[PDB]
């Protein structure tokens, strides 16, 4: 609830661009065509949003930024 809401304003605002190019099922690289440093760049400002352990190795190996969301309700 205030997760995926909180995450979609940082990717959103973030790599969201015009607020759209958010996408779970998307690499948030060539699907939104997105930097992969803004891309878990996002995911870690998300870390410190819910408190989370999310390393750089954990947006990019994720299987994509939503299991990043979907790894923050794990933790609630």
Do not use: H, P, W
Not at 26 to 53: C, R, T
Request: glycine share 4%; no cysteine.
């Amino acid at each position: 609830a205030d997760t995926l809401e909180r995450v979609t304003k940082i990717i959103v605002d973030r790599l969201g661009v015009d607020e759209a190019d958010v996408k779970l099922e998307a690499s948030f690289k060539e699907d939104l065509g997105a930097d992969s440093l803004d891309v878990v760049e996002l995911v870690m400002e998300l870390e410190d949003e819910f408190d989370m352990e999310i390393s750089d190795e954990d947006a990019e190996k994720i299987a994509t930024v939503g299991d990043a969301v979907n790894y923050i309700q794990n933790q609630q």
